[PDB]
Amino acid sequence: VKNKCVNFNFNGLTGTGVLTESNKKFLPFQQFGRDIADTTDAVRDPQTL
Amino acid sequence: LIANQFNSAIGKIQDSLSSTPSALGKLQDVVNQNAQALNTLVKQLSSN
């Protein structure tokens, strides 16, 4: 579910927020993305890459 | 004479300000310090 405030549980990484189709171009060995304040702000869906 | 000196001095003020880039440091430093303080506060969230 996108563009709604939801509780997400991505492979045990737990959080709350709005999931949006992104423009960040991950390299294929990367599976997360952090902020300056060490909070995840990009994630890769484990079922549809 | 006083009119010409006054007009010339004002013009020298504006183009001297237009040329020198480090003139307004008294203001600029203030802004910098505040932003810098906030910056350290944010990265204190990433300490164990």
- Collect all residues of chain A within an 8 Å Cβ-Cβ radius of residue B35: none
Q: From CA A11, how far away is CA A46, in angstroms rounded?
A: 8
What is the resolution in angstroms?
A: 3.2
Question: To probe the interface with B, which of A36, A39, A40 has the most B CB atoms within 10 Å?
Answer: A36
Which uninterrupted H or E stretch holds A5?
A: strand A5-10
Is residue B45 within 8 Å of residue A37, measured between CB atoms?
Answer: yes
Q: DSSP 3-state assignment of A23?
A: coil
CA A19, A17, A41 angle in degrees (round to 5)? 70
Residues ≥6 apart with Cβ < 8 Å to A14? A7, A8
What technique solved it?
Answer: cryo-EM
Token pair, residue B44, equals 């204190």
Rg (Cα) of chain A, in Å, rounded? 11
If you measure CA to CA, which chain B residue comes closest to A40?
A: B46
Is residue A9 within 8 Å of residue A45, measured between CB atoms?
Answer: no
Token pair, residue B28, equals 């600029």
